[model samples]
Target: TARAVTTCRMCGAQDWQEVVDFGPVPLADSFLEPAASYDDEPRYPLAVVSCRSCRLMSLTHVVDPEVLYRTYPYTTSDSETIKKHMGHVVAVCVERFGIPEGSFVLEIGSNTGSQLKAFQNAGMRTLGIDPARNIAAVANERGIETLPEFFSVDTAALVKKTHGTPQLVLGRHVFAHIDDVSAVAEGVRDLLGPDSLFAIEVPYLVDMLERNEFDTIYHEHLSYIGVGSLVALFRRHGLRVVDVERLAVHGGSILVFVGLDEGTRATAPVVEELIALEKERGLYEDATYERFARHVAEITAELTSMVRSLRAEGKRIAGYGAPAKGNTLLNVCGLTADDLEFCCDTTEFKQGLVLPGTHIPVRSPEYAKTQAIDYYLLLAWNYGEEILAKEGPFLADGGRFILPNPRPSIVPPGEHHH
Candidate 1:
């Protein structure tokens, strides 16, 4: 279900400059039951490349979404941070876009329909489209109407025919997961009117490189989205970005509001400002990504050494949470079950499985609260503050965290950073 790429998915250009090759790696979210055999686990070529024409940073190979997400384990409602953020995002969309009370809001890749729920609570109609059948079922059971299907041009047409035009089409953290960006754009164009806003929230390419959030790269994420890339991508499909906001969620994300290019008046000043900042950060430069590759390798080495040395001291270590990104980090750093005894997570579905490649067993978050783990590798470093606050007892007992990003550091149990 994996294939190599010839041209850039954004610009269709053959000028692809290799950014970083993660090599053959298992799917980030592939948590296997204990009965499963490691020999049968499939590995795909994992790498990132930048397009010379559009400056779109994207994967060199794509794994089929059907294989990656049909039984997906993550849900937006599971995290309090994401749930609150979803509510705020919906409120802002309604306020800024002047969405009417009865306006329809369709959210693509609406896992568990959390955002759509927020829209519905605000007196709007909502529909969710997601590929993960299990997650879709959860949403529907909760009274959130969700159709388990991948968002394509055809899907959009069908939704338009059945539900009528949507005032706001949104996809938080779903834009980058798509391999065919143009198809989604065309679909959105078909449904967009003068007032419709195609609001997207995705991880920022600049933040990923700057923060060394390399673990976030996986087969499911087909692209590393940036303002310039979105500009070119939407413009090519008759859409223009009217507003942009830098959000703190998912490490750091770009919330973009796109409207019909032909009728949209002036582009927001922040949109141009962010593009300028991105260029200032050398987002479009080849040497920058080359340096990023070196940084990733360096961090990987430092983390492995730190974990082994800590283990040598007879200190008990376990992962705080088993996020998919952490699986990528564990595999790349060669930290197996031997290094991390187990990974703690709140998601019930993933509690009894082992992370792909690493074979680190997943446990309930109660283990972190009850066990004596001297050092906890902060696998969910993005939620470091929130998790740490909840694990105050562990910190009071002198438990520390191994933060792996930009560099590896032993963070004390108290105030995380300056």
Candidate 2:
């Protein structure tokens, strides 16, 4: 059973604005063996709650991290796109932040140590801390020294004692997964040296609302972060977000630069720019999220109708990418094995198993070509550019893609971004 959080996570406030509820969806990343029974599957209520005080948006329930991370099947190296992105991430940080060579670098929630490996290649000694023992083991075997422990104040002390203070502490795409971000911020503060840079990246809340990437919400993602909320989060620990950069990864993400107040290695102008953008986009408005909730229902209905209509026409439909976001889409839209013949994925580990709730068989991308699937619901739409280019032959052969957001629309066989 999941525990419903009665108060705001960032601020200890009971006042909240209820957002749209995507009820009781299966764990987004928990695919099952083909033989596993559907009845054995567990579902948790997935919804967003906005704090009236801090303007932080978070999930309605907090599932145990042990249950979520112990058996995590995903690795940072799962996608070549991600692996390459990790390199880019490291290069940007090293150059922009002036991260010195031969300095200790630590990553929190370092899945598979892909980013840390890049840092290592950049001539830095690296340590990784993650709760996912399986990933930590794999990372260690691959020569990236990693500790199989969740990051906390205790972990911070251990890191300082055993590994020494880090010149850079990074948590990319993992900040939102943390439940007690205040404690994590404190831990990060304790680990930082005089010139050490700390960066946290999360899917930008405004982007999620505007782009209609609601499916990105899952049990693991506890917070929907924006520049405004981030300022308040770090301020509690005497850390400030000095700079913020927006990226197209994970639908949309913000990479925030943090430092101790006096370190003062920051660009305040850039920070205020994003916060202003957030306000213009209604990031703190309760009415904005309520409107978004109404839009979500409309979009969900549109996608469901399209999938059903296509099946009625005897069209063979498959899934393009089996990202965690895709699972939420499948479960909420109520599309199952009957709707999607199979799902395409690059991860070799997930190829034979079925999606957690929808029961759609996972197959390799090569299998997609062999099956001549008529239309693929672009489950991983964020990587649309890469996937579409790779499937040039399929598109050339009159196959189209159904993009699932803002309104489910079909792309023409010879065209893009319809």
Candidate 3:
């Protein structure tokens, strides 16, 4: 039997309140080579719970990390917005930390070296650690040094011995994927100097609850972070969060700056204010999660019913963007290839594959447009504005869209409404 996560990974709190149940879901990134050729599709219980003691939101049933990340296909450079975001993050780090040209920078779970490339362009020595063999190989081919293994104490020691202490260590949207976050934090401690900064970006739990972004709940994301739980987790590993900033990317995220607990820098007022905001938003209470579950169910029912009605009217519906969040939305809403004819993605790696459980074949934008798709469900609604700008031709040609978030509504043709 797989390990049951009955206690909080941060605080060891056995008391947890059930938030939402997504039933059994296939691995989000386990895209099949062929639509109907899967031998034995694996599925795991998809559910979220809140820790009573530390206020961390985490998936109760877990999947093996080896199976989930060893062959990941989601590359960071797939989205134009993400590429630009990486450049912006690098600039922010350089200015804020006063990173010298010869500074050593390290990144965890660096997908295809996008961030490392930015750092290198800024005249810094860069190293990347990623578990995805294919992605790591791509990064190495592109002239970036990357280790194709999980970042643990052993790997941290190896990096420290080989490259000395990194002046800046960072991870963007990667902290929440860790199951044993404390171990990662400890490895970071071993790799950082007293004055070094450890910056991490995670999708904020408060934003998820407020925006009704329940689709972000997938197997890959182990924890939904809030300031409350983050402070507790890093403090356990002799680290402390010094600052927090809200980012509009990834459907609203938080960038946390952490350093040695004894560092000279004082905690920023934003950190304290964000923690208090989380409390005011009821992130620490069970009732908030209960209300969230109800909202999720209602949204699922509404979207599913709306799509089914369109199908009955002989309308051709397709999905846009083969993101992990799309899998969660489709599976939880009980949608399949019959309802959504297919999905279109810009990433070449995913174009020939099929969505994990739905088996909705993913194709290129050209193929999707040629099919004369009537309505496209924008699964990657977080990039709605960018996508809408690029797909202006589709909308002008009488194609409609369905934005499934915050509220499930129809986006009529010839409009830039999100």
Candidate 4:
């Protein structure tokens, strides 16, 4: 059954080491619908197992892409910070490649057409493919052409047959959600021209495990990739990564430039060095995984202890960021609304909703500001600086912002205490 789950997504290895197990959790993609009446969604075991065979970090089971991507609720363009990032990315793609007006650009999982809008605004022909109907509807309303379908090799074939080869393809935060990454690579190759540039930005595995970004581990993320793994994976589908650079986008991300031919490629020594570092640490060894399991337990204990202590002191604790990782942290720590009453998020869809497993209601950021709350937990700490800067006014009147990863700390406005 299930084809026996062979081959590693990272190094394509049949040999694998079982890392520590995270218990069953819910589908990380499930966001609460405020009007749903009941909050009795199903949960699954969320194990953070590693493949020592390939140094690839992943979940044990593959959640159906059709189930997850189709009817998705979140939109990438909702955040002002995300829009700026998209603008920067569009500017770079245009400047670096000299993308001509009317040239076709394709974006995979183009939520709400934020990136595609930038391309279209530049007088370039753009196309978006997304499974989220509501988001795709938004894109259509904005005059952005989008294909409402789950992206696959077949989708790529259809696009090429009708739309012609794409000049530029973007996978910003889309790569991690893919299960059949090989099929995705093949799709890119089929739809790409000789000089076409396919750019990918994925969350770096190094930052997650090292920084204790345990919250980043969730089902929406099918794979945690590094330059080393990507270089190998892409090449298998007749694609070559010409360059790789790091950005602090998601914790830390690796921006990769991929092309059709192996020649004229940009090879960075960092790929080899990182791979060597992982190997040296026995990333593919069973004994090494045993150690990783221990770390996961330690992290769970650490976060739980802090929240429990806060509750003991009669603190009215709440959370921020309805992100997938936030679900992971809360689920693993067994946190409930009793400990941290609710959460606040910038995205409107998540507002007035509840988290999947814990059923802690998610409200607007204004709630955390206006409502009388003692402790505020920042779930999406990767954008800590940006969020804090904007929400500074709220914290001015005794609202303590909690940054809870790497180590939990409270930021009291107008105070220098760390």
Q: After superposition, how far is residue 243 of candidate 3 from its true place, in Å?
A: 0.9
TM-score quality measure for candidate 3? 0.96
Best model number under lDDT: 3
* TM-score of candidate 2 to 2 decimals: 0.96
lDDT of 4 by residue, 265-304 (tens): 3555665776676667555467655655667677678778
How many clashing pairs per prediction, in order?
Answer: 0, 0, 0, 10
Which model, 1 or 2, shows the larger lDDT? 1
Candidate 1's C-alpha lDDT?
0.87
Q: Which stretches of candidate 1 lie over 4 Å from their true place?
A: 413-418
* Candidate 2, 1-418: lDDT as tens digits: 9888886666677888889788888899888889746796999999888987777888999999999998886887455677777888888788987778998889998988888888988999999998888989999999989999989999899999998988889998888988888889889888887677898888988888997888888899999988888787787787878888888788888888898877747656989988888888887778888888877888888888888898899999999989898999888889988999999888999999999888999999887768968889999888877777777788788898999765577776345433
Ranking by lDDT: 3, 1, 2, 4
Over 4 Å off, model 4? 1-4, 32-40, 262-292, 412-418
TM-score ranking from best to worst? Answer: 1, 3, 2, 4
Give per-residue lDDT, candidate 2, residue 280. 88
In model 2, state the lDDT of residue 366.
82
Deviating ranges (above 4 Å) for candidate 3 = 35-39, 413-418
All candidates: TM-score: 0.96, 0.96, 0.96, 0.90
lDDT of each: 0.87, 0.85, 0.88, 0.77
lDDT of 1 by residue, 266-306 (tens): 57799999989988999878899899999998999988888
- Among all windows of 10 consecutive residues in model 1, the one with the lowest summed lDDT is 409-418
For candidate 2, list the clashing residue pairs, or say none: none
